Write an enzyme that holds these catalytic residues in place. Sequence first.
Site, PDB file in Angstrom:
ATOM      1  N   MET A   1      23.728  28.993 -26.799  1.00 49.16           N
ATOM      2  CA  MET A   1      24.515  29.102 -28.151  1.00 49.16           C
ATOM      3  C   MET A   1      23.790  30.364 -28.887  1.00 49.16           C
ATOM      4  O   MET A   1      23.943  30.571 -30.111  1.00 49.16           O
ATOM      5  CB  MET A   1      24.027  27.719 -29.013  1.00 49.16           C
ATOM      6  CG  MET A   1      24.765  26.590 -28.099  1.00 49.16           C
ATOM      7  SD  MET A   1      25.066  25.409 -29.197  1.00 49.16           S
ATOM      8  CE  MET A   1      23.377  25.231 -29.930  1.00 49.16           C
TER       9      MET A   1
ATOM     10  N   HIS B   1      15.464  32.745 -26.928  1.00 49.25           N
ATOM     11  CA  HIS B   1      13.934  32.769 -26.758  1.00 49.25           C
ATOM     12  C   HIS B   1      13.365  32.548 -25.316  1.00 49.25           C
ATOM     13  O   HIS B   1      14.541  32.563 -24.445  1.00 49.25           O
ATOM     14  CB  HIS B   1      13.473  31.444 -27.841  1.00 49.25           C
ATOM     15  CG  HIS B   1      14.100  30.031 -27.264  1.00 49.25           C
ATOM     16  ND1 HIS B   1      13.614  29.491 -26.279  1.00 49.25           N
ATOM     17  CD2 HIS B   1      14.553  29.372 -28.155  1.00 49.25           C
ATOM     18  CE1 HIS B   1      14.298  28.333 -26.150  1.00 49.25           C
ATOM     19  NE2 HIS B   1      14.968  28.487 -27.439  1.00 49.25           N
TER      20      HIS B   1
ATOM     21  N   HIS C   1      15.167  30.131 -22.981  1.00 51.91           N
ATOM     22  CA  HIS C   1      16.394  30.545 -22.213  1.00 51.91           C
ATOM     23  C   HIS C   1      16.249  31.586 -21.353  1.00 51.91           C
ATOM     24  O   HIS C   1      16.910  31.714 -20.191  1.00 51.91           O
ATOM     25  CB  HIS C   1      17.274  31.476 -23.316  1.00 51.91           C
ATOM     26  CG  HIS C   1      17.634  30.313 -24.494  1.00 51.91           C
ATOM     27  ND1 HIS C   1      17.168  30.639 -25.727  1.00 51.91           N
ATOM     28  CD2 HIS C   1      18.484  29.372 -24.570  1.00 51.91           C
ATOM     29  CE1 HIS C   1      17.719  29.667 -26.564  1.00 51.91           C
ATOM     30  NE2 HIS C   1      18.817  29.123 -25.821  1.00 51.91           N
TER      31      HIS C   1
ATOM     32  N   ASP D   1      19.421  40.330 -31.233  1.00 51.27           N
ATOM     33  CA  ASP D   1      18.902  41.221 -30.141  1.00 51.27           C
ATOM     34  C   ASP D   1      19.294  40.314 -28.855  1.00 51.27           C
ATOM     35  O   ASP D   1      18.582  40.683 -27.793  1.00 51.27           O
ATOM     36  CB  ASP D   1      17.277  41.590 -30.300  1.00 51.27           C
ATOM     37  CG  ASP D   1      16.335  40.198 -30.270  1.00 51.27           C
ATOM     38  OD1 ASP D   1      16.891  39.356 -30.738  1.00 51.27           O
ATOM     39  OD2 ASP D   1      15.363  40.415 -29.864  1.00 51.27           O
ATOM     40  N   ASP D   2      20.171  39.203 -28.848  1.00 52.51           N
ATOM     41  CA  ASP D   2      20.334  38.575 -27.686  1.00 52.51           C
ATOM     42  C   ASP D   2      20.835  39.500 -26.730  1.00 52.51           C
ATOM     43  O   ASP D   2      20.093  39.259 -25.571  1.00 52.51           O
ATOM     44  CB  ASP D   2      21.498  37.524 -28.282  1.00 52.51           C
ATOM     45  CG  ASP D   2      20.992  36.309 -28.876  1.00 52.51           C
ATOM     46  OD1 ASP D   2      19.612  35.921 -29.147  1.00 52.51           O
ATOM     47  OD2 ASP D   2      21.743  35.800 -29.620  1.00 52.51           O
TER      48      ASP D   2
ATOM     49  N   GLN E   1      18.106  41.415 -24.995  1.00 55.30           N
ATOM     50  CA  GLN E   1      17.171  40.472 -24.355  1.00 55.30           C
ATOM     51  C   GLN E   1      17.651  40.323 -23.052  1.00 55.30           C
ATOM     52  O   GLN E   1      17.057  40.533 -21.744  1.00 55.30           O
ATOM     53  CB  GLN E   1      16.838  39.171 -25.040  1.00 55.30           C
ATOM     54  CG  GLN E   1      15.884  39.584 -26.192  1.00 55.30           C
ATOM     55  CD  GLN E   1      15.435  38.138 -26.633  1.00 55.30           C
ATOM     56  OE1 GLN E   1      14.593  37.439 -25.969  1.00 55.30           O
ATOM     57  NE2 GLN E   1      16.046  37.404 -27.697  1.00 55.30           N
TER      58      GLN E   1
ATOM     59  N   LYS F   1      14.753  20.422 -22.040  1.00 56.74           N
ATOM     60  CA  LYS F   1      14.417  19.977 -23.284  1.00 56.74           C
ATOM     61  C   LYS F   1      15.699  19.154 -23.886  1.00 56.74           C
ATOM     62  O   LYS F   1      15.422  18.062 -24.634  1.00 56.74           O
ATOM     63  CB  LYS F   1      14.210  21.293 -24.095  1.00 56.74           C
ATOM     64  CG  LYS F   1      13.953  20.927 -25.773  1.00 56.74           C
ATOM     65  CD  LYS F   1      13.982  22.140 -26.641  1.00 56.74           C
ATOM     66  CE  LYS F   1      14.883  21.916 -27.596  1.00 56.74           C
ATOM     67  NZ  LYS F   1      16.276  22.162 -27.376  1.00 56.74           N
TER      68      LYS F   1
ATOM     69  N   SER G   1      12.031  26.269 -29.175  1.00 54.46           N
ATOM     70  CA  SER G   1      13.759  26.022 -29.771  1.00 54.46           C
ATOM     71  C   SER G   1      13.824  26.937 -30.672  1.00 54.46           C
ATOM     72  O   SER G   1      12.991  27.153 -31.601  1.00 54.46           O
ATOM     73  CB  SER G   1      13.585  24.450 -30.258  1.00 54.46           C
ATOM     74  OG  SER G   1      15.007  24.179 -30.921  1.00 54.46           O
ATOM     75  N   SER G   2      15.306  27.319 -30.791  1.00 52.17           N
ATOM     76  CA  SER G   2      15.427  28.020 -32.081  1.00 52.17           C
ATOM     77  C   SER G   2      15.253  27.351 -33.336  1.00 52.17           C
ATOM     78  O   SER G   2      15.136  27.879 -34.300  1.00 52.17           O
ATOM     79  CB  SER G   2      17.015  28.672 -32.077  1.00 52.17           C
ATOM     80  OG  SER G   2      17.834  27.417 -32.188  1.00 52.17           O
ATOM     81  N   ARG G   3      15.283  26.136 -33.289  1.00 56.23           N
ATOM     82  CA  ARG G   3      15.010  25.326 -34.433  1.00 56.23           C
ATOM     83  C   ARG G   3      13.710  25.485 -35.010  1.00 56.23           C
ATOM     84  O   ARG G   3      13.229  25.057 -36.469  1.00 56.23           O
ATOM     85  CB  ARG G   3      15.232  23.717 -34.372  1.00 56.23           C
ATOM     86  CG  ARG G   3      16.615  23.407 -34.364  1.00 56.23           C
ATOM     87  CD  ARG G   3      16.977  22.177 -33.867  1.00 56.23           C
ATOM     88  NE  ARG G   3      18.470  21.984 -33.854  1.00 56.23           N
ATOM     89  CZ  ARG G   3      19.006  20.819 -34.556  1.00 56.23           C
ATOM     90  NH1 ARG G   3      18.097  20.060 -35.510  1.00 56.23           N
ATOM     91  NH2 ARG G   3      20.188  20.569 -34.869  1.00 56.23           N
TER      92      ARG G   3
END
EC number: 6.3.2.1
Lengths: 276, 276
Positions: free
Chosen positions: B38, B42, B45, B75-76, B79, B147, B183-185
């Site tokens: 999604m 990070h 991924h 910047d996805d 990366q 995860k 996690s992005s969270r």
Amino acid sequence: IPAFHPGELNVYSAPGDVADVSRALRLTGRRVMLVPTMGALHEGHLALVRAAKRVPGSVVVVSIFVNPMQFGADDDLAQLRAEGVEIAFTPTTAAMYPDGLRTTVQPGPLAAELEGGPRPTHFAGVLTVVLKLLQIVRPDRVFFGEKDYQQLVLIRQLVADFNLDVAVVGVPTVREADGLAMSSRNRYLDPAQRAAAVALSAALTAAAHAATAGAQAALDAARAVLDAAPGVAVDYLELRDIGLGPMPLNGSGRLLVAARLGTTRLLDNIAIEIGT
Amino acid sequence: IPAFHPGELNVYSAPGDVADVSRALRLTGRRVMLVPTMGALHEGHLALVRAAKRVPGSVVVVSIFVNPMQFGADDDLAQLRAEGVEIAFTPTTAAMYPDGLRTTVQPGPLAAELEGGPRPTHFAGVLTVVLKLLQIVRPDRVFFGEKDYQQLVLIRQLVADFNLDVAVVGVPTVREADGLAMSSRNRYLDPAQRAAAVALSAALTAAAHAATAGAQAALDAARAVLDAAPGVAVDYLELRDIGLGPMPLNGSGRLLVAARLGTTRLLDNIAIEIGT
């Protein structure tokens, strides 16, 4: 990999066996065609097989599987062998549902209309099964009869909506000489019922010609023929667009009928061009 | 066919463009690997991408798509380019849902448990999207992080239940130095919350060692650590078998935790060997 004998009938019941043979054949450049059926084959089915066979070099896979009833709701192989079918896939319920009813396909709202009125879980079963057969066999093209038109439309929706890389090929209904759409259900009719059953196709063909005079003329013509027929009880008679949405003012549509003769429910449908 | 430049990042947003390029590449013998995401990438991924890249000659396809919220519920690319990803698939909602929510996937009852308790339509969205991405890309292998363990289990169910010809590869959770699952969270946590958040992994790792003394010792150890942590509110802490059925008397299991730190809900889970 299981044995496969080219140019002969090969019968498999394990999903893994068909998957493996199909993959091997596709790698050689032979295109794989799938004709899903519930057995009790007649000429209507043989037409689907012959349409598949017209694709040069194709391996035709015919599946025979009767989907179990959801809550609250034999010379087949010889015929296939005579048609040059090389693969018959005949799985058991246990092989198809080894984990019961777990992940399934939820159709769009069209599945609640028309045939889904009486049987609101029917098309979820159909689309679940078809999706599985498509993933097991991975055909280039899959063939369905237009007789079950709502089913065909729903399969097109499944393929569009899940981005399935298969061509869906609708084949015209094969009829008896008097017009009666072939169906395994016709076997349940006695001679008088079989004679009266011509009313469905007569009504639809009358409507298709009456349609030069518009949509109401078409519907009224079909209804009049059904009303003239003894012991035909009409469940529905609906004119819709070709995707089974609302009929357009002027243009292409489909007229669908469902009627009962004694205990046997029969369906038929026809292309309609409104004001043409 | 759309342009594809080997050994460079190629970005596509139309499903048909990816489908065409993927098919062409597979025909050359390059195996296609799919990493669904999604976005907001990070190291967790990047681990999925690196696992995909270990397969020789693989074309790695990374999808970035945020599934729309169902009713009642940068910047996805740089990366990815730096990781040697050759295909990024970034469809719009309209391209994924050109007919709205029509045919969808209905998960099994596991989807109503654990994360499905608070969000009973979440996994139907996830499995619908994943099914579509699998059919668009047709990968040999698809990679998911452990995860989101319940998600991984449900994807395995989707693949089994629909007879999908793809290998599902679960990749171990990537953690910060202190154990916190990436996690992005985590970006939503303030420094004090970020420090307190180590309690989830601490609780699970304590449980995994306490488990030599049995299942109750494992659960009690984890609960004690969570209860020691300031401003960690536990939503659930459950020990299950590895397929998320009931824990066995003696054997392999999985312990899952969900907890809130202020407004941010975090998850973690770990392998447990009971009495080992």
